[PDB]
Design a protein around this nucleic acid. Structure first.
Lengths: 128, 37, 126, 136, 65, 176, 69
RNA sequence: ACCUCGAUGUCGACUCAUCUCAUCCUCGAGCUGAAGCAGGUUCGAAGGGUUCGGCUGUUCGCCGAUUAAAGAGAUACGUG
RNA sequence: UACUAAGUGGAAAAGGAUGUGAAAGUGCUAAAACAGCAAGGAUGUUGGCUUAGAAGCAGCCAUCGUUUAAAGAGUGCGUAA
């Protein structure tokens, strides 16, 4: 419900952030305070029905998408998915999979790495 | 109803029935009603 | 194919005969998200939360020497946890599922191939 | 225009098209084709119209061949003259079709757009259409 | 949607949704009064000149023919 | 396939009168007298505890016949054992309706008084001045009455305004 | 005129405006039967006519309204 | 070129009109990019109605003003 | 002995026909087949971009993958989001 792709900074300027009945600042305070660690870095945001949308939230462990962007060594948007640009290897693939080791609900190294390739071969890098 | 002499399924839910030996169609789409197929 | 149906029935008969413990409890709405939550909890357990047809589970059970002829006529979504290789932790998880629903009646199965009353099997589970 | 280079006579006997297909009795180049259930006259204007219609629906990679081409002439008297002073002046060009004759073939084109083009051709010819495939 | 457009989402100033519109001035005249008509006057619009952009062929028709 | 379907029965709540001219099912929730014309291909059996009517002949019109007679048997059984009810909302600004004795009034765009008589075997109940409930023993008659009430007003896209069937979310059009 | 009710009006203003205002009177009728005004701090006034309004007298409430008053 | 050329009385106007519906209007109804009015679409329905003046012999046509409405036609392009 | 539910018979172009029989092939299948219904339908993922704002359905490059009976950048409906 209302997937939210926002940084770790201000939770005020999100129009789709407050659409299920939740207010803006009442969480934004603690959101900023506890996400000052990675302010300027993305932190995905989703929500579930609490009882009446008085206050609820859940922050997601970051999937490798900004690190997967620099895995291609390009800071430009990837409208070219069949082009293998950037270097990724089993060592780097496993390092990336460490991030998503807890991020996914099916737990095993090979399958999580297959997730990383499947999301990454379409990233704009035909990964190893 | 649309005055024509050859009607074929034009929306995905335009199904053809024959009422009293007059061929007509039924569909949710209201721009797709016609008879005398 | 019907011959394929028979050979699959034989294969799952062999599977249940080989497997000592196994529990199949009918779920309303067995949910995939909480299913893979179970999968994280089970991890590399010999158990495999799985979903196969309910008629094959009749003829599997009636080929594979386990008690109950009218106990197989369950109606609805059925998923079997084959308890083995940490069968206890599988029992723990399936009783956690028992407490995750309204109240799920004992359909079939037991800890290691000897079914009895289910007022204590859940206590082995927790 | 589909006007032949030269004609020995401007004022010929057209055809007796009540007979089985003399030539072009089967598709030769493409994989599917339109065939006439019976024979009749066709002008040149409608041949050009059918060609352009099938070409608009033709892909940039598909190719199409025509079998029947205007060889005969067609004459009409003015609407003020009584019966018989001579023979008038030819107006336009006409080709003959025998029963079972094929006229259009398409190739290097998807089969769905193939049947699309065949329907487009059929909706424009007075002769009754029928659809076949390249047998060999 | 019909005037070179800015309909690519929503922009909000944290309590008021201010939407940008890079719109040619020729298409402002009936635009603003009809926007007030349709919106029941519950909004407004600010006068700021963006830039000198390309003229559409509709206005080019009167250049030469 | 609808052929000799399983139609359950409890021969104490409702009693049956199976005749070649009228089928009379009677119980505490009234009686239903299904009228069936003479010269029918179907044969009726004296049965209880899931009565089933079989087919003596196999042909298209007879097939449709059996399907429809079985469906109407189901309809009449559930009617005589449970009854039928329909409910209709009325979405408007000044629209309303209420009851006088056995007649439903209507307040509509009409500047002229509108009342409609209630057919026999059915009863109306008012809970809010616009939404009405009609309860009787026949789905046939209750639907006919619902259409009769609807016939005076049709919902339109530019504004929620009409005889809503409690579950119809109509398409919307945005003019002015 | 059609489309109005005193309770409806005060409810609408309370929700959409946050007016937090106080009523003084209560019309009698729904949309056409406006022939008297219940008064809250004092007695209801019954209007003997329509678009004339020249004879105003303040008559006792029948208790189906005075309790809510 | 087929009866009527040992007689078929052929334009136009007045009057009398009768009939058809591919309906001009009143009528029913659907649909709409049908806010509403104001619109278009065609299915039914021929029950009824379906003007007055200027112009040149007039049909045609144009014009003037005007009606809920200022039809297309058939009847020796109606009626000596 | 078959067809017609069209008074076809007892007139006819183009096209349309899920009207209906007969014929020769032809998939599943009492182990539930075909529906409809009772239930899930996950997951990187609002894949990457775009227009500050487009992010399963504005659109383009991809259009691949884990758990799994299966889950599709989704089958369509919903907003500029």
């Amino acid at each position: 419900i209302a997937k939210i792709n926002l940084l770790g900074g201000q939770a005020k300027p999100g129009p789709a952030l407050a659409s299920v009945g939740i207010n803006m600042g009442e969480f934004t305070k603690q959101f900023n305070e506890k996400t000052k660690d990675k302010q300027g870095e993305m932190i995905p945001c989703v929500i579930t029905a609490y009882n009446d949308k008085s206050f609820d939230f859940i922050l997601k462990t970051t999937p490798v998408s900004i690190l997967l962007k620099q895995a291609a060594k390009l800071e430009k948007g990837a409208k070219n998915a069949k082009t293998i640009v950037g270097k990724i290897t089993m060592a780097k693939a496993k390092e990336i999979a460490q991030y998503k080791l807890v991020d996914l609900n099916a737990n095993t190294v090979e399958a999580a790495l297959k997730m990383v390739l499947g999301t990454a071969k379409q990233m704009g890098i035909e990964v190893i | 109803m649309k005055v024509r002499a050859s009607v074929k399924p034009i929306c995905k839910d335009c199904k053809i029935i024959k009422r009293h030996q007059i061929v007509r169609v039924i569909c949710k789409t209201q721009k797709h009603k016609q008879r005398q197929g | 194919a019907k011959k394929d149906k028979a050979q699959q029935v034989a294969d799952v008969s062999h599977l249940l005969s080989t497997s000592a413990g196994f529990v199949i409890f009918d779920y309303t709405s067995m949910s995939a998200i909480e299913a893979t939550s179970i999968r994280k909890k089970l991890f590399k357990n010999g158990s495999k939360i799985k979903v196969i047809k309910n008629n094959i589970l009749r003829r599997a059970l009636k080929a594979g020497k386990f008690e109950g002829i009218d106990e197989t006529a369950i109606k609805g979504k059925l998923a079997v946890a084959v308890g083995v290789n940490e069968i206890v932790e599988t029992l723990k998880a399936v009783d956690g599922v028992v407490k995750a629903k309204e109240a799920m009646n004992f359909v079939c199965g037991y800890f290691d191939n000897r079914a009895f009353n289910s007022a204590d099997l859940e206590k082995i589970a927790k | 225009m589909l006007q032949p280079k030269r004609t020995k006579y401007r004022k010929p006997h057209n055809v007796s098209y009540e007979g089985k297909a003399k030539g072009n009795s089967y598709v030769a180049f493409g994989e599917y084709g339109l065939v006439a259930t019976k024979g009749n006259w066709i002008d040149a204007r409608a041949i050009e119209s059918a060609r352009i219609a099938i070409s608009k629906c033709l892909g940039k990679t598909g190719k199409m061949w025509i079998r029947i081409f205007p060889h005969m002439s067609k004459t009409k008297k003015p609407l003020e003259v009584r019966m018989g002073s001579g023979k008038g002046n030819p107006e336009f060009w006409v080709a003959v079709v025998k029963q079972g004759t094929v006229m259009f073939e398409v190739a290097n084109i998807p089969e769905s757009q193939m049947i699309k083009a065949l329907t487009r051709a059929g909706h424009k010819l007075p002769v009754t259409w029928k659809i076949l495939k390249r047998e060999e | 949607s019909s005037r070179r457009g800015l309909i690519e989402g929503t922009e909000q100033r944290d309590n008021v949704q201010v939407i940008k519109a890079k719109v040619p001035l020729k298409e402002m005249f009936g635009y603003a009064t009809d926007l007030r008509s349709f919106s029941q006057g519950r909004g407004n619009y600010v006068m700021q000149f963006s830039h000198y952009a390309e003229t559409p062929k509709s206005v080019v028709n009167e250049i030469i023919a | 396939k609808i052929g000799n379907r399983t139609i359950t029965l409890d021969p104490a709540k409702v009693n049956l009168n199976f005749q070649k001219d009228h089928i009379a099912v009677k119980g505490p929730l009234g009686q239903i007298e299904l009228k069936l014309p003479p010269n029918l291909p179907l044969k009726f059996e004296l049965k209880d505890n899931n009565l089933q009517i079989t087919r003596n002949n196999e042909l298209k019109q007879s097939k449709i016949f059996h399907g429809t007679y079985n469906a109407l048997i189901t309809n009449a059984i559930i009617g005589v054992t449970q009854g039928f009810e329909k409910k209709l909302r009325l979405v408007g600004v000044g629209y309303r309706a209420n009851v006088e004795g056995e007649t439903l009034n209507l307040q509509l765009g009409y500047s002229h008084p509108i009342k409609e008589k209630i057919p026999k075997g059915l009863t109306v109940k008012v809970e809010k001045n616009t939404e009405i409930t009609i309860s009787g023993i026949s789905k046939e008659l209750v639907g006919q009455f619902a259409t009769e009430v609807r016939k005076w007003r049709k919902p339109e896209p530019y504004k929620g305004k009409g005889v809503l069937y409690f579950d119809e979310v109509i398409v919307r059009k945005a003019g002015k | 005129k059609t489309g109005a009710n005193f309770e409806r009006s005060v409810q609408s203003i309370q929700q959409r405006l946050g007016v937090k205002a106080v009523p003084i009177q209560l019309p009698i009728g729904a949309e056409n039967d406006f022939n008297g005004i219940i008064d809250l701090i004092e007695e209801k006034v019954y209007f003997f006519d329509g678009g004339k309004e020249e004879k105003a007298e303040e008559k006792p409430i029948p208790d189906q309204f005075k309790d809510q008053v």
